[PDB]
Design a protein around this ligand. Structure first.
Ligand code: SF4
Ligand SMILES: [Zn+2]
Ligand SMILES: [Zn+2]
Lengths: 698, 138
């Protein structure tokens, strides 16, 4: 198609010249473009030069990229008849890419890597001075396994079944195949991870093309890289962890103190560099991204052992308990907090080097490690590494006392996001940035400063198949104003709005998905609604996303949606744009043909974080009180707009309330503003015009 | 604790706890105001904290935010010895090996003091404190 062909030419010229490009792709028709453009762009140079580094935000997009990559393999193998070196490595979740926890553990928690470290330590201990090896090991590093992938694609599911048949473990296959430089499909939380980005950065060996897919929550991921809430219980886990460290000190000092002195000599002689250069296949700890930290010559507590580290650690956690037991409102400057700490007790600005080393020493002296104590020690260790370094833009904040019991909390505020993304513009080039929910695309040259080119979407045809109306008059124009407050006002008006949702849902009974700015309105209309005929006549049942989302509940709600729409029933999907699961799988009538939006998206205000980042961005780009109520809400609404668009062969309609939507842009800017009662008949005609123009335009 | 803060005034929570609870550095024992004031007011004698025999002196008290007696003693002795040693063989030229070795010696001295060993090495550390003070006077 010519429209996507233009984006192919843009990707070509930006990959051949520019080092980074902001490309705006139309929603639903821009996923399969870059996947083939990158491969052909690799074949025109020479077959193995740059590799695809596709980055998504969810796992569903990773699976879609895997099956579409398989469509690329079949596409290139069915048109030429020649077999080439296949690519495609599926890097997914650790719990989903492991087989043993499904045989004995029967758990899908985040502690599967700890059990994997127990098995790996079992292998190392059966190869040194002596649990079993695991299920199958010692044959995952051979050439045959290194060639099972280039000869045949085994990614994720095919790798899970292939490992279940060939009696292998997929974790070491993927880990050993990161250096093979295949098409890696991982998420943003792995490229910028203060524990994963280092090893991945050391295995990919750079020199590739990075593809930022749906790059609209990049600031959200850079924010989520820090901010850890200290909620008084971590102080108890740190106290019990310090007691466990004292017991371990009594154990290593009781009988076996030679290994601690030998490793201590390894620290005095070769320091952290030798300690990390000698150990292989050993569990590591957290770090504030060593490539971004750039701090060498880590001295081990001014050349000291473990008793001094646990003494200064007890003093440090006691100082933390002292700083967390205060009045109520108090803000901290990370420099003033470090100076106050120095006034309480001298410890200098080197507890970072004192944590990254002592944690590894304790690991080298521990054989039975408790998970909660070690986890709390890793939390306090991260807090130390981030009060010792990284201060520009960092802002320690104490949560106020609001009952005062449920209160002693201390959160650290992260720094400028440009710093975190920075290394990719030295490691790499021609980083393609594609997103279908960006409008306007000027807040990415502004916020996050980087020199790039701007390419907007140039595809807009068959406007009769993309019904895009907006509702302004709700029959009284009183719910659009009351539906914009943080706390709802006049419950009777909200009940009238819900009645309007009952009338609208009754008018168009063909799959409805409703998005809310928060769960307060949902919990207010679901308690006592004075009506339920929509569930009793057209919808049979209603689908509600819990304010505390669950994986199995959401999965049963989505499968219930597909089966309900495949039985000719339909169901209303009351979800939150700010909640979990942003979806993205459409291209069928099983999804909501009509989508309802309750006003415009809103972010929770009256929070210390929004004021800290508010004044920070105010000092940075001077975009105060203007972009945090239109850019974020524009992205959250665009997440709902992207679900309506699903190819030109399909149709749909999305109703946006509130006049304030005119102040923001939108994908395909062709919108007509009228009432809701008129939109009922208008949609009643569109449900037939969309069915008439299909065979006429074909 | 809320159940022990003075052998006579161990439970003053329902009596409007408006008095502080001082701790003498030569006893490490909590005594409420109305008791300790009479203690050092009638003469420097020992407190009856669970049969305590160490003499409580007049004044020379301190406010405690409670960081355990071990860490409080280690930070008091830590600061005192840090002031006795001052900046000797530290920031004199910029060396990192001998500096970390001397810091290791100081922290080993503080370790021997907080552990006590056998009341023999700690006395040698006290003589080391007198020697360092004599070096700081000169
Ligand atoms: S070797 Fe594989 S199956 Fe065994 S614990 Fe590790 S990841 Fe799990
Ligand atoms: Zn008393
Ligand atoms: Zn006493």
């Amino acid at each position: 198609y010519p429209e996507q062909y233009n984006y192919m030419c843009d990707i070509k010229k930006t990959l051949d010249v520019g080092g980074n490009s902001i490309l705006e792709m139309p929603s639903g028709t821009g996923k399969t473009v870059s996947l083939l453009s990158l491969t052909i762009a690799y074949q025109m140079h020479y077959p193995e030069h740059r590799k695809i580094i596709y980055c998504s935000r969810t796992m569903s997009e990773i699976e879609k990229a895997l099956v579409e990559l398989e469509n690329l393999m079949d596409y290139r193998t069915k048109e030429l008849g020649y077999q080439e070196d296949f690519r495609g490595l599926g890097l997914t979740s650790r719990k989903n890419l492991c087989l043993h926890p499904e045989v004995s553990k029967e758990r899908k928690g985040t502690v599967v890597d700890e059990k994997c470290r127990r098995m790996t330590n079992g292998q190392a201990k059966r190869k040194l001075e002596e649990v079993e090896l695991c299920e199958y090991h010692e044959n995952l590093y051979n050439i045959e396994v290194e060639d099972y992938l280039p000869k045949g694609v085994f990614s994720f599911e095919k790798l899970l079944k292939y490992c279940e048949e060939k009696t292998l473990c997929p974790y070491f296959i993927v880990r050993r195949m990161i250096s093979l430089c295949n098409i890696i499909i991982y998420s943003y939380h792995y490229l910028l991870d203060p524990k994963i980005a280092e090893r991945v950065s050391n295995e990919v060996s750079k020199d590739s093309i990075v593809i930022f897919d749906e790059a609209h929550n990049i600031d959200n991921v850079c924010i989520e890289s820090l901010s850890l809430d200290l909620t008084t219980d971590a102080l108890r886990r740190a106290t019990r962890g310090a007691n466990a460290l004292d017991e371990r000190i009594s154990e290593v000092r009781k009988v076996d103190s030679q290994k601690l002195q030998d490793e201590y000599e390894k620290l005095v002689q070769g320091l952290x560099x030798x300690x990390x250069x000698x150990x292989x296949x050993x569990x590591x700890x957290x770090x504030x991204x060593x490539x971004x930290x750039x701090x060498x010559x880590x001295x081990x507590x001014x050349x000291x052992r473990a008793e001094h580290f646990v003494s200064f650690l007890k003093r440090l956690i006691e100082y933390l308990k002292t700083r967390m037991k205060v009045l109520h409102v108090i803000s901290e400057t990370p420099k003033s907090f470090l100076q106050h700490l120095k006034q309480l007790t001298f410890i200098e600005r080197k507890p970072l080097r004192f944590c990254s080393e002592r944690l590894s020493l304790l690991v080298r002296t521990l054989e039975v490690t408790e998970v909660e104590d070690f986890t709390a020690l890793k939390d306090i260790a991260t807090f130390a590494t981030l009060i010792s370094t990284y201060e520009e833009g960092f802002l320690l904040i104490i949560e106020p006392y609001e009952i005062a019991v449920p209160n002693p909390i201390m959160r650290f505020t992260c720094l400028d996001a440009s710093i975190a993304i920075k290394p990719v513009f030295e490691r790499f080039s021609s980083v393609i940035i594609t997103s279908g929910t960006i409008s306007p695309l000027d807040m990415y040259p502004r916020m996050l400063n980087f020199k790039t080119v701007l390419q907007k979407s140039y595809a807009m045809t068959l406007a009769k198949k993309s019904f895009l109306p907006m509702i302004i008059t709700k029959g009284s124009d009183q719910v659009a104003i009351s539906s914009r407050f943080e706390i709802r006002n006049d419950p009777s008006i909200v009940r009238n709005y819900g009645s309007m949702l009952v009338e609208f849902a009754k008018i168009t009974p063909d799959g409805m998905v409703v998005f809310f700015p928060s769960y307060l309105y949902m919990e207010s209309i679901v308690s006592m609604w004075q009506t339920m005929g929509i569930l009793d006549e057209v919808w049979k049942h209603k689908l509600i996303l819990v304010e505390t989302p669950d994986a199995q509940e959401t999965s049963l709600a989505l499968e219930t949606y597909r089966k309900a729409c495949s039985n000719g029933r339909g169901a209303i999907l009351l979800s939150v744009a700010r909640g979990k699961v942003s979806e993205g799988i459409d291209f069928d009538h099983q999804y909501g043909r009509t989508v309802l939006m309750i006003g415009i998206p809103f972010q929770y205000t009256e929070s210390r974080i929004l004021k800290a980042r508010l004044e920070f961005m105010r000092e940075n780009y001077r975009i105060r009180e203007n972009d945090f109520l239109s850019f974020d809400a524009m992205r959250h609404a665009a997440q709902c707009l992207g679900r309506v668009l699903r190819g030109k062969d399909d149709y749909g309609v999305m109703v946006l309330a509130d006049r304030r939507f005119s102040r923001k842009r939108s994908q395909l800017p062709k919108w007509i503003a009228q009432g809701l009662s008129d939109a009922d008949l208008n949609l009643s005609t569109d449900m037939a015009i969309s069915n008439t123009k299909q065979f006429l335009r074909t | 604790e809320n159940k022990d803060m003075c052998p006579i005034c161990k439970t003053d929570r329902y009596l409007s706890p408006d008095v502080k609870f001082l701790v003498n550095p030569e006893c490490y024992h909590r005594i409420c105001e109305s008791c300790v004031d009479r203690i050092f007011s009638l003469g420097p004698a020992q407190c009856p904290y669970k049969g305590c025999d160490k003499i409580l002196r007049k004044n020379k008290f301190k406010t405690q935010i409670f960081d355990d007696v071990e860490v409080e003693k280690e930070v008091d002795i830590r600061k005192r010895v840090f002031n006795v040693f001052n900046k000797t063989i530290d920031d004199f030229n910029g060396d990192l090996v001998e500096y970390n070795k001397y810091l290791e010696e100081v922290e080993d001295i503080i370790y021997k003091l907080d552990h006590g060993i056998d009341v023999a090495k700690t006395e040698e550390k006290l003589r080391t404190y007198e020697e360092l003070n004599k070096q700081l006077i000169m």
